[PDB]
Amino acid sequence: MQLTPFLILLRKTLEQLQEKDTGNIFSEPVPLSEVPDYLDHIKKPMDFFTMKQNLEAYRYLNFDDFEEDFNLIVSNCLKYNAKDTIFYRAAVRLREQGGAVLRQARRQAEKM
Template identity: 40%
Template sequence: MDQLRVEDLKGDPLSNPPPPPPSSLALQCEEVLPVAETLDARVLSPEEQRRLADQEENTLRELRLFLRDVTRRLAVDKRFNIFSKPVDIEEVSDYLEVIRQPMDLSTVMTKIDTHKYLTANDFLVDIDLICSNALEYNPDKDPSGTHGGIKVLAMPYLHPIPFIVHYF
């Protein structure tokens, strides 16, 4: 049996080249093994299914509580008050011609309450939509940077939660 010796490690590595790969004849002589059977998925007992469903519902409840808190904080912040209700179409008649998918914080809150968000990322997509709609409709009218700021303000609230993947 060939063993690696300390002497083999000294000197020029090219003076002790590794052994050549096995020849194709040696590979042809190897035994071909049959493909292993695939295992059927384990069937959960009714009790295990109930516990799993309860755990999932608890996780989603925690997510909804968290998202409500973030949305409430954004809605009460005076800098983002303009995003708290849908755009008044009577006041801004061309809004729906420019924006195909309107979004606001009250709609976000309704989606939270009706269990439309199954992940934090779903919520963040709507927050991003609020920002992009504002920037699309008002491309040069926002010197304060408020439209993009809603995303920045939401980030500290979202950062410590473990199920939030880096979105921004």
């Protein structure tokens, strides 16, 4: 646990993104057992737990790779689900609120 300012920032940012997911519907992988066709359409599933595991294994080297995985959580959800669903509407809201979190966090990352 030799921390860096960058990794601390990513940890804080991930917590701020998860706070926007008040129903915790993006906290864990979409359960493939409950949805057997998910991988037929979604090439790379993503969720906040997987992102936390990547972070704790020190696999995010820059802000772009971190943001790319967040964007997968949203875009996977919009792709798989019909527009008139709780999941789709939640992904739209997360894109909006999470985008603001990422804008502020990238500004802090830029001055590192």
